[PDB]
Structure formats: structure tokens, C-alpha cells
Homo-oligomer: A and B are copies of this chain.
Amino acid sequence: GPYLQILEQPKQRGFRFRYVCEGPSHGGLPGASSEKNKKSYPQVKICNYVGPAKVIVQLVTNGKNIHLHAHSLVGKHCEDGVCTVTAGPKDMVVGFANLGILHVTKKKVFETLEARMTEACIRGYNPGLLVHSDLAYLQAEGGGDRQLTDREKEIIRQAAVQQTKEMDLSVVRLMFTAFLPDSTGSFTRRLEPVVSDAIYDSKAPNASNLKIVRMDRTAGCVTGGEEIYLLCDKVQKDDIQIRFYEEEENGGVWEGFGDFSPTDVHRQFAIVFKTPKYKDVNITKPASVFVQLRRKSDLETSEPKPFLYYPE
């Protein structure tokens, strides 16, 4: 049967969430394959069907129970924190460019969440899967705008209370839901929703892109701990490591680590450490190893930097 597939995920790290106060037009959510001279965007495709379809995109939480998120989608073809796009008759690929992730404040979560949930139930935006189980009957909206009963409003209030610390404002996910044309012509046949990879706010220090701005000594000796000053982007002192790796011909990689205490991390932006061994010098010619920053929690690495090892 018909199903929805994500052709290109969004980039998990690097994108910055914007609060309302920061204004609009700060850049769209890049796709996973996007580089500086190849602006790519998230892309989905509907398979086993060539015809008209309606695709909606919602921001969902990153917890075990995938629920709605208080952050909003903004940009072209966005309304009330949700994106809606026409999957054309012939071309079944759909890209999402110029999308922004509006970062709600901790205070204004509840209200926002409530509204979103309400709109979902009022528009059939997967009220059963995301808002609450017993609301699954509100998916068949019929035409467009409906009316809600007080019992339905109090279930929404209940899940609006659910918004406890299980709401993580530093990570969201894209959920894409397709809709096939009904016998009446309306776009109501719901396909299976597909969740994308988790997008992390680059302003979160636990999930920012690690980067070595510049290093003190570009080379060193295998003799022992030679002190090096490394200027980097924002890292957390208790979650950061400096890894020297060496790619080998057998497929394996040699690992060494710089020696430093969390106190040696100066105000999250610089590290003073000591270089490790190699081990020893067999080939008296210098060796071209690499060095990078590695986050201990998620094993995320920075772009490599060419380091050199000297003998006696």
C-alpha cells in the first residue's frame, strides 16, 4: 500500500532556535546533506501513489511518548506552528525550505501547548497519537472547521498539565503526516505518520556543534605531556574530551587523549591540556595524527585538526 518516506532528514545539530523577540528570517532549517555551497532542505516522498496529496509537518517531543511540542514551525506555508504543503499530482517528492523553529519561553509553554492541542483536535492533526489516546475519534474532521465539547476541552487541559519536565525545549522532531484524497475529493485518508531524526538547538551547550577555533602548538613530541592551549566554541567542563585519533591501514584507529581537569576548561571556551603518547617512535620520521573535541555524553565530535608527532 501507500506509505510516506523521508528522503532527506534535517540536520540534527547546528541550527539555532529563535525566540519570538528575535524576529523572523534568521535562516531555514537545513537538510542533513546541506553544506555551505549546497543549501539542502528536508525532503519526504510518498510511494505507491502518483496523485494529489496533502502533507502536514508538526513539531513533536523527543520522549518515549511522542506528544506535541510547544515550539512552533514558522515560514512559508506555516500556520499556528504547523506546516501544510501540497504533494503535487506527478512529482511525489516534497521539500521543506525556509522553515524556522520558534523557541517558546518556559513560562508561555502551557498556553501554547493547550492551543496547539486544541487546534489539532479541531483540525484532525493526529489527536490520538500526539495529544491523547481517547481523542483518536477526532481525526475524522469531515470537512474543515469543527466545534469541541467541554469534555474534549478538559482532556486537552489534562495533557496541557502533562507538560512537565518531559518537555525538553532543546530538542524537537519533525513528524510528517500524509493525506490521500477521499471519495468526496477531500484529503482525509490518513497515511502512517513518519517521525524524523531529532533536531537539537545549537544554543544548548549540551548539543551545540563542537569546534576547535585554533590551537597553541600545531605539533609536538611523543616524549610526554606537552602543554597546549586550545580555543574552542562553548563546551561544558564535565562533558568534554580531547581525542587524538590515527586512522590505520587495517581499518582500526589509534586513540589517545589529552590530560586535563574540568578546571582546565576556562569559562567554557578554552582548554589547557597536555599531549599524550603515540606510542614511542619506530619510524623516526614525524607522524600526521588528528585531534578533535569529543562530547562524552552523545559521543559527538568536532571537525578534525591535523597534529604532528616528533621523535627524540
Contact = CB atoms under 8 A, between A and B. Distances in A.
A141 interface: no
A249 interface: no
Interface stretch (A83-91, A236-244, A262-270): A262-270
Given A216-B216, A229-B216, A229-B229, A269 B272 contact: no
A302 to B, nearest CB: 15
A213 B266 contact: yes
A39 interface: no
A231 B229 contact: yes
Given A234-B267, A267-B234, A272 B214 contact: yes
Contact of A227 (B216, B234, B269): B216
Contacts of A270: 231, 266, 269-270
Interface string A255-286: 00000000000111110100000000000000
**Chain copies in the assembled complex:** 2
Interface string A202-236: 00000000000110100000000001010101100
A268 B270 CA distance: 11
A145 to B, nearest CB: 39
Contact of A272 (B231, B267, B268): B231
Nearest to A272: B214
Contacts of A216: 216, 227, 229, 272
Given A216-B216, A272-B214, A266 B231 contact: yes
A276 B233 CA distance: 28
Residue of A231, A269, A272 ringed by the most chain B CB atoms within 10 A: A231
Nearest to A227: B216
Interface string A170-214: 000000000000000000000000000000000000000000011
A23 B275 CA distance: 43
Contact of A269 (B214, B229, B267): B267
Contacts of A231: 229, 266, 270, 272
Nearest to A217: B216
A226 to B, nearest CB: 11
A213 B264 CA distance: 10
Contacts of A234: 267
Which 9 A-B pairs have CB atoms at the shortest separation, nearest pair first? A229-B229, A267-B269, A231-B266, A216-B229, A269-B269, A270-B270, A231-B270, A216-B216, A213-B266
Given A269-B269, A269-B270, 19 more contacts: A213-B266, A214-B266, A214-B272, A216-B216, A216-B227, A216-B229, A216-B272, A229-B229, A229-B231, A231-B266, A231-B270, A231-B272, A233-B267, A234-B267, A266-B269, A266-B270, A267-B269, A268-B269, A270-B270
